[PDB]
Amino acid sequence: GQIIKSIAAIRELHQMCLTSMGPCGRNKIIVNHLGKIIITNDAATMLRELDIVHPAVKVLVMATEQQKIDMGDGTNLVMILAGELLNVSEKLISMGLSAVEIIQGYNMARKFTLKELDEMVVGEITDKNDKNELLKMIKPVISSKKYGSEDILSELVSEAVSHVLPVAQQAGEIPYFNVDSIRVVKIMGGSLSNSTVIKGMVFNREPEGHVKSLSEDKKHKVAVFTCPLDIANTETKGTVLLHNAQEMLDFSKGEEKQIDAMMKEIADMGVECIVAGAGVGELALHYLNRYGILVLKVPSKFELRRLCRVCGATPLPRLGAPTPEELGLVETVKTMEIGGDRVTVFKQEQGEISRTSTIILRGATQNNLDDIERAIDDGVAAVKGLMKPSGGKLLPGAGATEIELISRITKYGERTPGLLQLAIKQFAVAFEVVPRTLAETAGLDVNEVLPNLYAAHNVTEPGAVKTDHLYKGVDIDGESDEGVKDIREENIYDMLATKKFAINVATEAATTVLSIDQIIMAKK
Amino acid sequence: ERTTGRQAQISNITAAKAVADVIRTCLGPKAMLKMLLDPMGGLVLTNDGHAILREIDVAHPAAKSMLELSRTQDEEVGDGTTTVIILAGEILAQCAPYLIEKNIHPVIIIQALKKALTDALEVIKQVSKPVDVENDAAMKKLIQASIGTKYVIHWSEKMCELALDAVKTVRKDLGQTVEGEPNFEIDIKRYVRVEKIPGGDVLDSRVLKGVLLNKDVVHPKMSRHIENPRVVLLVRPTLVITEKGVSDLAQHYLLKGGCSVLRRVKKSDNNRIARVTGATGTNCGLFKVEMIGDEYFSFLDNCKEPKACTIMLRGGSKDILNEIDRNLQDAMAVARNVMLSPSLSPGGGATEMAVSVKLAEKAKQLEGIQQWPYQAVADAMECIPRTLIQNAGGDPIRLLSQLRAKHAQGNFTTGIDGDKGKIVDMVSYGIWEPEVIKQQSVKTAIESACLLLRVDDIVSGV
Amino acid sequence: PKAESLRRDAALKVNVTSAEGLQSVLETNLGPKGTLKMLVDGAGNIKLTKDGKVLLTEMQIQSPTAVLIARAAAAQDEITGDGTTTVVCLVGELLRQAHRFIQEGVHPRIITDGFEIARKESMKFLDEFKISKTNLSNDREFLLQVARSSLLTKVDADLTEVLTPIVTDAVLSVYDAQADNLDLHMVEIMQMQHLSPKDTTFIKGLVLDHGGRHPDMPTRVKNAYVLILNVSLEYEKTEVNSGFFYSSADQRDKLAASERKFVDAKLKKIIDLKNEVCGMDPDKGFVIINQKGIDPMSLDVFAKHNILALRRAKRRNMERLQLVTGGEAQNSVEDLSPQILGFSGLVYQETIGEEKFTYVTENTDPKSCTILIKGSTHYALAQTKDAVRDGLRAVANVLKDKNIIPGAGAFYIALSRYLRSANMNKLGAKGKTKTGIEAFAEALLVIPKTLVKNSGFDPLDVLAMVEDELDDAQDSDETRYVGVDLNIGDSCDPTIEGIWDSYRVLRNAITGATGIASNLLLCDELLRAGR
C-alpha cells in the first residue's frame, strides 16, 4: 500500500496550498541557512526555497515550475487540481479498478474538455492596450493575493505596460512585450496613493558628484564606458610607482592632463552623461563637475542590457573614443526626491520610446513591501499571454469555470460505453475542490453556499436556448449577501491561455504518480 | 469509557461494518462456507448467517443492535437475513467520508435516508409484475424455490400440495373501504403452529381447522356423533370440556345430561378454541371421534374460517417430520409474501440495481443539501449484486458497469446468474423473489442505520 | 473511506498450510511399504497403529482445519472400514495442486464446482472399470489373495501367511450361501501374554476364561455332551434363619453337613445322566458348564467320573454357547431332561499355570467363530488386532457387493488418463473448468507416487512405464490392466498378483475426499469467538 501512503505524503502538503489560493492566502517566512529571510506569496517561488525530500512531490514541483516559466500565472490551479486527482483516484484503486484504465480515462476526458474551451469564451480582448481595458485582466491577478490593494495597484501596473508597448495592431510576427520590461523597486517610506509610474529604470543610489541633474535640452547623449577612468597604460601589469621624488611631479601632473584631455573631447561631442561600470578615481570626479556631466556608476551587468534597448547606447571596451554612431539618446533626465531621499531617475518624454519601465513602491510596512514586489511579477506574465496563442479569448473565473465543467463532463460520461465511465465521473467530481476551498477558508457554511452553486448552473428552462445567468461563480461575501452574485459585476475573468495550459500540466502531473507502483532509493 | 469528538462517529460505523464485511460470503446460493473457532473442539460448518452471528462475541454496542435486527428479520421471512445486515452496514461505509471528511451534520444524513426510503419503495413497485394469487399451480412453483435442493426433494410433489393447503387455511380474503384493509391478519407463529404426530402418510396429511386433542371419551358407552355439539371452556350444553382432570364421580352426574366430559386440556390451546367457538359452541361442523393412526382424535372444526388452527403433520417417522418443521415454516414465508400483494420482484440483484439507477436520476432534479448522500445510497444499493459477482468468479469491475448501462436501455428485471456468471434476464430464465422481502430489507436497513448515527457518545455506568 | 480488495487472501492459506503438515506425517505410513507410528500419553499407554483414524482420536489438534479431516473418516470406518489414510492423502494433495491456481487469480468456486463435475464423470467411468464377481463359494482360492491386501499393510508380511487361513475361514464358516449379510459381532477376540505371535491359530468355538484345575481331569475328551447348569454348587444355607450351636468341634460337622445335603442331593441326579446314556460306551464324555461357582468338595467327585468342572463364566459368553452347543439352560436339577444335552467334538484343554482355556471347537453347526490373538509384548496385541479388524471389514464388502476393483493404484492411474482425454473431446462444461479437472487428475496420481516413494524406487520411472504401456494396449485391441509393483519397481498385472479392493471402499473414498477438500477452500475467514 505504498501508492496510498504516497498520496498521504502529498496530502500533508495539499492543505498548505489550499490556504494559498484565495483571498485568505499568506506568505510564509523561510529562514535560510545563510541568515537570509525570503518572503513571497507566490507558490512557485516558495517551492524553490523549500527542500523537497520525497521525489513524488518533486513531480508536482516540476509541474508547478512549468506554469511559472511559460504562462507565469495559474501555479495555484495546477498544484491544487493535481492533488485532488489523487484523492478521487484513491477510491478507484481501493474499489479494485486498475490504474491502467484510470490513466486512459483521463486522456479521454482531457480531449473532451479542451474542445469545450472554445465554446465557453465570453468576451474577446481587442488588445487595445488602453489603461481602462487592462484593468479587467490585471484585477484577478492581484486578487486572491493581497486584499485592499487591488484598486490602487491596478492603475500603477496598467500604466507602465502602455509605456513600453509601441503602436501596432493585428501584427503577431514581431514580438514586443518581454518579461524583463517591468522592474519593481522598493524604498522605505511613503504610501500606496503617492506612488507614481516611471517610463524607465529607477536608480535609488547617489550620483556621487556635485552635479545633481542635467539640463532640459532635448536628446541627451548617454555613453556607457566599461573601462575604468585612469591614465592609459600597458594592459599587462602597469602599476604606477615612485622611485624618487623627482618623478612625482611628472607622474602626478601627467594623470591630470591626460584625463582632462579625454573629458574635453567627450564634452565637445554633446555627451552630458557618462556611465562607468567600473570604479571611478578621485581626480576624475573633479573634472566632471565643471563640465556639467552627470556621474553614474552601474557595476551590475544585468542593468546595462535593458539600457541598450532604450536610448541605444553601446558599451565601449576602451576609453576616450566617443563614437557618435553607438551613442544613445534620452529626451529628459531629472533628479527628484521620491520616498524621502533624493535619487536620480530615468524617464522619457516623446521620442526614443523606452521598452523597459519601472514602478516605484512606497509604504510603511516592510512585510507587505516585498509582497507587492512578488505580486507584480505574476502580473507581468499576464500581458505576455495576450499574443496569438489565444490571447484575446477569456473565460469566467472565481470558481465559475470548474463548476460549469461538471455538467458538460457528466453528460459525455453516459455517452461513452464501457469501463471509461468510472474515470469520467470522478474527473468532474475532482473539480469540486475549487469552490469548496474558497467557501471553507472564507468561513462560509458548506450547507449553504455549496448547494447554491449547483443550482446556479443547473436550472429548468422551458426551451432549448440557455437563459437567466450562467456567470454566477463563487462569492467571498465580506459584507452580506443571499446565495451568490454575478461575477460580471466585478469583471473578474480568466484568460484561455492560462486555463488551457493549466489543464494539460495538471493532467500529466497526476498521471505520473498513479503510474508509479514502486520507488527504489538509496542514502546519499 | 467515553468517546467524544469525531472519533465516536468512526467507531459507530466500523462496529457494524466489521460484522457486515465478514458475512458478505453468506449471500446467494453460491455462498461460501465459514469456519469459526470455538473453545470446544467443535466448529460451525454451516453458512447460515443467523447461526453464525449468534455465536460471534461482540464488544461495541452497535454490533449488538445489529444482532437484534437479525432475530426480528428471521421471524418475518425465512431468508434474506444477511441481506439486511450487509445493506445497513454498507450505507454507513459510503457515508463515512461525508460525515467525517466533508463535515456533514448527521441529522441531514438521517433526514435524507428517510426521504430516500419512500422513493426506494416506489421504484420497486414499478419494476414488480402482477401475479395471480388464486392459481393453485402457480403457488406451487413459487414455493418450489424453497423446496428443491433439500431433503424434501423426494416429497417435493407432495410438499407443494401440503404447503399450499397450509397457507390457504390461515389466509382469508376480505376487503372493503368501510372498515379498512385488514391485511388478512396472518400470523405464522401462533395460528400456523404445527403439531407432529408420528405415523401416517404425507400425502394423506390434511390441515384441520381447530384444536386437536389426544384425550378420548371418559365413558365406555356414549354417543360418538352429536348433531350440534357445543364446546364449553372452563344452559344444558352438549359437551363439557375441563382444563384440569375430572374425577370419576362427575362422570355419572353429567351422563344423564347428554354431554361428554373431556379433561386434561392445555391452557395455550384454549385461546385458539375461542376462534372456532367463541366461548370466553353451536354451528360445529363435525363431532366424529373416529380413531386415525391408533390414536384417538377429536374434531373441533366447523363451516367457518376463523383463521386459527393446528396443522396435523403425519409421516413415516418422527425424524422425517422434524426436518419438515423448519422446511415447511420457511416455505410458507414465501407464500405469505405473495398474499400481501400480487407482485413479484426479479432476483439475483436486479431489484437492487433498479433502485440505484432511478435514485441517481431523480436526485439531480431536487437540487438541495440532501443530493450528496443520495449518491452514497445508490452506491450501497449496487454492492448487494456486486457481492454475488465476487462470489461468481466474474470481473467485479466489468460486470458492474455493463449491468448498469443495460438499465438505461433494457428493463430493470435483468440480474446476475450464480450458475453462469454473466448478465442474463431473470424473468425468462425463471428467477423470481417476492417483493415483501425487498420492502423489509430496505426499510429495516435504513431505520437501523439512522439509529447507529444518533449516538455520539458512549456512556459507561449502571 | 474504507473499501478493501485485500480480503482476497486470508488465513485460508494457513488452513492449507496446516493441512500440508498433516499430509507429510501420513504420507510415510501409507501402504504396505509404510511405517508404523507410535504414540505415548506418558501414563503407560503405548499403542502402535498404522491407521490414520485410530491415531487422530488420541491426538488433539487446535487447528480447526484438521478437525474435519478426522471427522471425514467417521463415515469411512463405519461403512467402508478401509482406506482412511488414502482419503486424507487425497484431501491434502488436492490443496497443494490448487495452491498454484489460487495465486494466479482463479476463483475458488470454479475450483470447487470443477471437482463436483469431475466426480460425477468419474462415477460413469467407475461402472465400466469394475469387475463383477460371482457369489459362488468356489472363489475362496481367489479370496486368499484379496484378503492379503489389508493384511500386508499393517504387518511386516511375515505373519500374513499365518493370519491368511484364519481370516478366510472365519467368515465363510458361519455364512450360508445367499445374499443375506455377515455379522462380525459374533467373532470374539481374546489375548494372552507370555507367548509368541506366530502361535496364532483359528478357533471354531468359544474360548472360556477360567478353566478347571485338578491333576486327574482328562486332557482330551471326544464326543461329549454340553449341559448348562444354572444352580450354584457353592456352600448353601438353610432357607430359614438359624445358627450353628456346637459344644465341641465334632458337633459342628453334623450341623454343617445338614446344609450340604442340598447340594449332594442334586449331584446324585447329575451323575446318573452320564451312565444312563452311553455310560460304558467308548469315546463318550460328560461336561458341566456351571456358570456359577464350585465348592471344593465336588473337585474329587467330578474327577473320578472324568467330568470337566468350570466356574465363573461371563454372562455375555453364555448366550453364544446356546447357539454353538444347542443345549438349553437348565435352572433346576429335578427338571433336567436327557434332551437338554447338546453335541460336541474332541475337547482338549491346554495346561498353563496362569490361565486355562476350554475349547468348544469341532461342532456340526457352531454358527460362531473366535480369533485368538496372543503375543508377548504390548504392541504385538494392538498391532495384530488392528490388522484383523481391518481385514474382516475389508472382506465384508467383498462378499456383499459382487463388484471388485484392482488395487495398487490401478484405478487412480486409469481414471486420471480417461478424464484427461475426455475433457478435450466434450468441452460442454466451460473453458475455465479445465483448471479444476487438471488439478483433480494430478491429485489422483499422488497415491501411486506415495507407494513407490517409501520403497525407494524412482517415482518418475514408474510413471513413464505405465503411461507408455497403456498407449500400446489401445492400439493392440485388447484389455490389459496395469498396476504398480513395489518390490520389483516395474509395472505388474493386478489379476495375476491378486491385489484387489472393494467397490464400496473406493467409491466413498473419491466421493468423500472430494466434498471435504472442496469445503476447506470455501472458508473466507477464520473467526475466534465464544470465550
JSON list of N, CA, C and O in Angstrom, two decimals, chain A residues 263-297:
[
{"chain": "A", "resi": 263, "resn": "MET", "atom": "N", "xyz": [38.24, 64.13, -21.33]},
{"chain": "A", "resi": 263, "resn": "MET", "atom": "CA", "xyz": [36.93, 64.65, -20.98]},
{"chain": "A", "resi": 263, "resn": "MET", "atom": "C", "xyz": [36.55, 65.87, -21.81]},
{"chain": "A", "resi": 263, "resn": "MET", "atom": "O", "xyz": [35.36, 66.15, -21.97]},
{"chain": "A", "resi": 264, "resn": "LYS", "atom": "N", "xyz": [37.54, 66.60, -22.35]},
{"chain": "A", "resi": 264, "resn": "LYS", "atom": "CA", "xyz": [37.23, 67.76, -23.17]},
{"chain": "A", "resi": 264, "resn": "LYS", "atom": "C", "xyz": [36.68, 67.34, -24.53]},
{"chain": "A", "resi": 264, "resn": "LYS", "atom": "O", "xyz": [35.75, 67.98, -25.05]},
{"chain": "A", "resi": 265, "resn": "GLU", "atom": "N", "xyz": [37.23, 66.28, -25.11]},
{"chain": "A", "resi": 265, "resn": "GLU", "atom": "CA", "xyz": [36.73, 65.80, -26.40]},
{"chain": "A", "resi": 265, "resn": "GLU", "atom": "C", "xyz": [35.34, 65.19, -26.27]},
{"chain": "A", "resi": 265, "resn": "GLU", "atom": "O", "xyz": [34.53, 65.28, -27.21]},
{"chain": "A", "resi": 266, "resn": "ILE", "atom": "N", "xyz": [35.04, 64.56, -25.13]},
{"chain": "A", "resi": 266, "resn": "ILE", "atom": "CA", "xyz": [33.72, 63.97, -24.94]},
{"chain": "A", "resi": 266, "resn": "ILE", "atom": "C", "xyz": [32.68, 65.06, -24.70]},
{"chain": "A", "resi": 266, "resn": "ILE", "atom": "O", "xyz": [31.55, 64.99, -25.20]},
{"chain": "A", "resi": 267, "resn": "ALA", "atom": "N", "xyz": [33.05, 66.10, -23.94]},
{"chain": "A", "resi": 267, "resn": "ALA", "atom": "CA", "xyz": [32.11, 67.19, -23.68]},
{"chain": "A", "resi": 267, "resn": "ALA", "atom": "C", "xyz": [31.81, 67.99, -24.93]},
{"chain": "A", "resi": 267, "resn": "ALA", "atom": "O", "xyz": [30.71, 68.55, -25.06]},
{"chain": "A", "resi": 268, "resn": "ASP", "atom": "N", "xyz": [32.75, 68.06, -25.87]},
{"chain": "A", "resi": 268, "resn": "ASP", "atom": "CA", "xyz": [32.52, 68.78, -27.12]},
{"chain": "A", "resi": 268, "resn": "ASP", "atom": "C", "xyz": [31.56, 68.04, -28.04]},
{"chain": "A", "resi": 268, "resn": "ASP", "atom": "O", "xyz": [30.91, 68.68, -28.88]},
{"chain": "A", "resi": 269, "resn": "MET", "atom": "N", "xyz": [31.46, 66.72, -27.91]},
{"chain": "A", "resi": 269, "resn": "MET", "atom": "CA", "xyz": [30.55, 65.94, -28.74]},
{"chain": "A", "resi": 269, "resn": "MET", "atom": "C", "xyz": [29.10, 66.04, -28.30]},
{"chain": "A", "resi": 269, "resn": "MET", "atom": "O", "xyz": [28.22, 65.55, -29.01]},
{"chain": "A", "resi": 270, "resn": "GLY", "atom": "N", "xyz": [28.83, 66.65, -27.15]},
{"chain": "A", "resi": 270, "resn": "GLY", "atom": "CA", "xyz": [27.47, 66.79, -26.66]},
{"chain": "A", "resi": 270, "resn": "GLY", "atom": "C", "xyz": [27.02, 65.71, -25.71]},
{"chain": "A", "resi": 270, "resn": "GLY", "atom": "O", "xyz": [25.81, 65.54, -25.53]},
{"chain": "A", "resi": 271, "resn": "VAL", "atom": "N", "xyz": [27.94, 64.97, -25.10]},
{"chain": "A", "resi": 271, "resn": "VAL", "atom": "CA", "xyz": [27.59, 63.89, -24.18]},
{"chain": "A", "resi": 271, "resn": "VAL", "atom": "C", "xyz": [27.59, 64.46, -22.77]},
{"chain": "A", "resi": 271, "resn": "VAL", "atom": "O", "xyz": [28.64, 64.82, -22.23]},
{"chain": "A", "resi": 272, "resn": "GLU", "atom": "N", "xyz": [26.41, 64.55, -22.17]},
{"chain": "A", "resi": 272, "resn": "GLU", "atom": "CA", "xyz": [26.25, 65.09, -20.82]},
{"chain": "A", "resi": 272, "resn": "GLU", "atom": "C", "xyz": [26.18, 64.01, -19.75]},
{"chain": "A", "resi": 272, "resn": "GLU", "atom": "O", "xyz": [26.09, 64.34, -18.56]},
{"chain": "A", "resi": 273, "resn": "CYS", "atom": "N", "xyz": [26.23, 62.73, -20.13]},
{"chain": "A", "resi": 273, "resn": "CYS", "atom": "CA", "xyz": [26.13, 61.64, -19.17]},
{"chain": "A", "resi": 273, "resn": "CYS", "atom": "C", "xyz": [27.16, 60.57, -19.50]},
{"chain": "A", "resi": 273, "resn": "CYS", "atom": "O", "xyz": [27.21, 60.10, -20.64]},
{"chain": "A", "resi": 274, "resn": "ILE", "atom": "N", "xyz": [27.95, 60.20, -18.51]},
{"chain": "A", "resi": 274, "resn": "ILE", "atom": "CA", "xyz": [28.98, 59.17, -18.65]},
{"chain": "A", "resi": 274, "resn": "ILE", "atom": "C", "xyz": [28.68, 58.05, -17.67]},
{"chain": "A", "resi": 274, "resn": "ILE", "atom": "O", "xyz": [28.62, 58.28, -16.46]},
{"chain": "A", "resi": 275, "resn": "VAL", "atom": "N", "xyz": [28.48, 56.85, -18.19]},
{"chain": "A", "resi": 275, "resn": "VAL", "atom": "CA", "xyz": [28.18, 55.67, -17.39]},
{"chain": "A", "resi": 275, "resn": "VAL", "atom": "C", "xyz": [29.45, 54.85, -17.28]},
{"chain": "A", "resi": 275, "resn": "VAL", "atom": "O", "xyz": [29.94, 54.31, -18.28]},
{"chain": "A", "resi": 276, "resn": "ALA", "atom": "N", "xyz": [29.99, 54.74, -16.07]},
{"chain": "A", "resi": 276, "resn": "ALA", "atom": "CA", "xyz": [31.21, 53.99, -15.80]},
{"chain": "A", "resi": 276, "resn": "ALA", "atom": "C", "xyz": [30.84, 52.74, -15.01]},
{"chain": "A", "resi": 276, "resn": "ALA", "atom": "O", "xyz": [30.43, 52.83, -13.85]},
{"chain": "A", "resi": 277, "resn": "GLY", "atom": "N", "xyz": [30.99, 51.57, -15.65]},
{"chain": "A", "resi": 277, "resn": "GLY", "atom": "CA", "xyz": [30.69, 50.32, -14.98]},
{"chain": "A", "resi": 277, "resn": "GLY", "atom": "C", "xyz": [31.68, 49.93, -13.91]},
{"chain": "A", "resi": 277, "resn": "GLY", "atom": "O", "xyz": [31.34, 49.15, -13.01]},
{"chain": "A", "resi": 278, "resn": "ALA", "atom": "N", "xyz": [32.91, 50.45, -13.99]},
{"chain": "A", "resi": 278, "resn": "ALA", "atom": "CA", "xyz": [33.95, 50.15, -13.02]},
{"chain": "A", "resi": 278, "resn": "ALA", "atom": "C", "xyz": [34.11, 51.33, -12.06]},
{"chain": "A", "resi": 278, "resn": "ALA", "atom": "O", "xyz": [33.38, 52.32, -12.11]},
{"chain": "A", "resi": 279, "resn": "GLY", "atom": "N", "xyz": [35.09, 51.21, -11.17]},
{"chain": "A", "resi": 279, "resn": "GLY", "atom": "CA", "xyz": [35.34, 52.26, -10.20]},
{"chain": "A", "resi": 279, "resn": "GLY", "atom": "C", "xyz": [35.83, 53.54, -10.86]},
{"chain": "A", "resi": 279, "resn": "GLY", "atom": "O", "xyz": [36.42, 53.53, -11.94]},
{"chain": "A", "resi": 280, "resn": "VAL", "atom": "N", "xyz": [35.59, 54.66, -10.18]},
{"chain": "A", "resi": 280, "resn": "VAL", "atom": "CA", "xyz": [35.96, 55.98, -10.66]},
{"chain": "A", "resi": 280, "resn": "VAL", "atom": "C", "xyz": [36.98, 56.57, -9.69]},
{"chain": "A", "resi": 280, "resn": "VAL", "atom": "O", "xyz": [36.77, 56.54, -8.47]},
{"chain": "A", "resi": 281, "resn": "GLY", "atom": "N", "xyz": [38.08, 57.09, -10.23]},
{"chain": "A", "resi": 281, "resn": "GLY", "atom": "CA", "xyz": [39.11, 57.68, -9.41]},
{"chain": "A", "resi": 281, "resn": "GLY", "atom": "C", "xyz": [38.68, 58.98, -8.77]},
{"chain": "A", "resi": 281, "resn": "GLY", "atom": "O", "xyz": [37.61, 59.53, -9.02]},
{"chain": "A", "resi": 282, "resn": "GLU", "atom": "N", "xyz": [39.56, 59.50, -7.91]},
{"chain": "A", "resi": 282, "resn": "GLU", "atom": "CA", "xyz": [39.27, 60.74, -7.20]},
{"chain": "A", "resi": 282, "resn": "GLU", "atom": "C", "xyz": [39.42, 61.96, -8.11]},
{"chain": "A", "resi": 282, "resn": "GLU", "atom": "O", "xyz": [38.59, 62.87, -8.07]},
{"chain": "A", "resi": 283, "resn": "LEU", "atom": "N", "xyz": [40.48, 61.99, -8.93]},
{"chain": "A", "resi": 283, "resn": "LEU", "atom": "CA", "xyz": [40.70, 63.12, -9.81]},
{"chain": "A", "resi": 283, "resn": "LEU", "atom": "C", "xyz": [39.72, 63.15, -10.98]},
{"chain": "A", "resi": 283, "resn": "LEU", "atom": "O", "xyz": [39.58, 64.19, -11.63]},
{"chain": "A", "resi": 284, "resn": "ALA", "atom": "N", "xyz": [39.04, 62.04, -11.26]},
{"chain": "A", "resi": 284, "resn": "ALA", "atom": "CA", "xyz": [38.09, 62.02, -12.37]},
{"chain": "A", "resi": 284, "resn": "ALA", "atom": "C", "xyz": [36.81, 62.76, -12.04]},
{"chain": "A", "resi": 284, "resn": "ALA", "atom": "O", "xyz": [36.18, 63.35, -12.93]},
{"chain": "A", "resi": 285, "resn": "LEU", "atom": "N", "xyz": [36.39, 62.75, -10.77]},
{"chain": "A", "resi": 285, "resn": "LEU", "atom": "CA", "xyz": [35.17, 63.43, -10.37]},
{"chain": "A", "resi": 285, "resn": "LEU", "atom": "C", "xyz": [35.32, 64.94, -10.31]},
{"chain": "A", "resi": 285, "resn": "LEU", "atom": "O", "xyz": [34.32, 65.65, -10.29]},
{"chain": "A", "resi": 286, "resn": "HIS", "atom": "N", "xyz": [36.56, 65.45, -10.29]},
{"chain": "A", "resi": 286, "resn": "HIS", "atom": "CA", "xyz": [36.77, 66.89, -10.23]},
{"chain": "A", "resi": 286, "resn": "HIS", "atom": "C", "xyz": [36.50, 67.55, -11.58]},
{"chain": "A", "resi": 286, "resn": "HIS", "atom": "O", "xyz": [35.95, 68.66, -11.63]},
{"chain": "A", "resi": 287, "resn": "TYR", "atom": "N", "xyz": [36.89, 66.90, -12.68]},
{"chain": "A", "resi": 287, "resn": "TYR", "atom": "CA", "xyz": [36.68, 67.48, -14.00]},
{"chain": "A", "resi": 287, "resn": "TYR", "atom": "C", "xyz": [35.23, 67.35, -14.46]},
{"chain": "A", "resi": 287, "resn": "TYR", "atom": "O", "xyz": [34.75, 68.19, -15.23]},
{"chain": "A", "resi": 288, "resn": "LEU", "atom": "N", "xyz": [34.53, 66.30, -14.02]},
{"chain": "A", "resi": 288, "resn": "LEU", "atom": "CA", "xyz": [33.14, 66.11, -14.43]},
{"chain": "A", "resi": 288, "resn": "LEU", "atom": "C", "xyz": [32.20, 67.12, -13.80]},
{"chain": "A", "resi": 288, "resn": "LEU", "atom": "O", "xyz": [31.08, 67.30, -14.29]},
{"chain": "A", "resi": 289, "resn": "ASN", "atom": "N", "xyz": [32.62, 67.78, -12.72]},
{"chain": "A", "resi": 289, "resn": "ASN", "atom": "CA", "xyz": [31.75, 68.76, -12.06]},
{"chain": "A", "resi": 289, "resn": "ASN", "atom": "C", "xyz": [31.72, 70.08, -12.82]},
{"chain": "A", "resi": 289, "resn": "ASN", "atom": "O", "xyz": [30.67, 70.73, -12.89]},
{"chain": "A", "resi": 290, "resn": "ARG", "atom": "N", "xyz": [32.85, 70.49, -13.40]},
{"chain": "A", "resi": 290, "resn": "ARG", "atom": "CA", "xyz": [32.90, 71.76, -14.12]},
{"chain": "A", "resi": 290, "resn": "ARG", "atom": "C", "xyz": [32.26, 71.66, -15.50]},
{"chain": "A", "resi": 290, "resn": "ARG", "atom": "O", "xyz": [31.70, 72.65, -15.99]},
{"chain": "A", "resi": 291, "resn": "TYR", "atom": "N", "xyz": [32.33, 70.49, -16.13]},
{"chain": "A", "resi": 291, "resn": "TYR", "atom": "CA", "xyz": [31.72, 70.31, -17.45]},
{"chain": "A", "resi": 291, "resn": "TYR", "atom": "C", "xyz": [30.23, 70.02, -17.38]},
{"chain": "A", "resi": 291, "resn": "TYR", "atom": "O", "xyz": [29.58, 69.97, -18.43]},
{"chain": "A", "resi": 292, "resn": "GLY", "atom": "N", "xyz": [29.67, 69.83, -16.19]},
{"chain": "A", "resi": 292, "resn": "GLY", "atom": "CA", "xyz": [28.25, 69.55, -16.06]},
{"chain": "A", "resi": 292, "resn": "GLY", "atom": "C", "xyz": [27.85, 68.17, -16.54]},
{"chain": "A", "resi": 292, "resn": "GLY", "atom": "O", "xyz": [26.78, 68.02, -17.14]},
{"chain": "A", "resi": 293, "resn": "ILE", "atom": "N", "xyz": [28.68, 67.17, -16.29]},
{"chain": "A", "resi": 293, "resn": "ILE", "atom": "CA", "xyz": [28.41, 65.80, -16.72]},
{"chain": "A", "resi": 293, "resn": "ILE", "atom": "C", "xyz": [27.90, 65.01, -15.52]},
{"chain": "A", "resi": 293, "resn": "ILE", "atom": "O", "xyz": [28.55, 64.99, -14.46]},
{"chain": "A", "resi": 294, "resn": "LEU", "atom": "N", "xyz": [26.75, 64.36, -15.68]},
{"chain": "A", "resi": 294, "resn": "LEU", "atom": "CA", "xyz": [26.18, 63.56, -14.61]},
{"chain": "A", "resi": 294, "resn": "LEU", "atom": "C", "xyz": [27.00, 62.30, -14.39]},
{"chain": "A", "resi": 294, "resn": "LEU", "atom": "O", "xyz": [27.35, 61.59, -15.34]},
{"chain": "A", "resi": 295, "resn": "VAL", "atom": "N", "xyz": [27.32, 62.02, -13.13]},
{"chain": "A", "resi": 295, "resn": "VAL", "atom": "CA", "xyz": [28.12, 60.86, -12.77]},
{"chain": "A", "resi": 295, "resn": "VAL", "atom": "C", "xyz": [27.18, 59.71, -12.44]},
{"chain": "A", "resi": 295, "resn": "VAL", "atom": "O", "xyz": [26.30, 59.83, -11.58]},
{"chain": "A", "resi": 296, "resn": "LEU", "atom": "N", "xyz": [27.36, 58.58, -13.13]},
{"chain": "A", "resi": 296, "resn": "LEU", "atom": "CA", "xyz": [26.54, 57.40, -12.92]},
{"chain": "A", "resi": 296, "resn": "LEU", "atom": "C", "xyz": [27.43, 56.16, -12.97]},
{"chain": "A", "resi": 296, "resn": "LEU", "atom": "O", "xyz": [28.24, 56.02, -13.89]},
{"chain": "A", "resi": 297, "resn": "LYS", "atom": "N", "xyz": [27.27, 55.28, -11.99]},
{"chain": "A", "resi": 297, "resn": "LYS", "atom": "CA", "xyz": [28.06, 54.05, -11.89]},
{"chain": "A", "resi": 297, "resn": "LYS", "atom": "C", "xyz": [27.11, 52.87, -11.78]},
{"chain": "A", "resi": 297, "resn": "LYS", "atom": "O", "xyz": [26.31, 52.80, -10.85]}
]
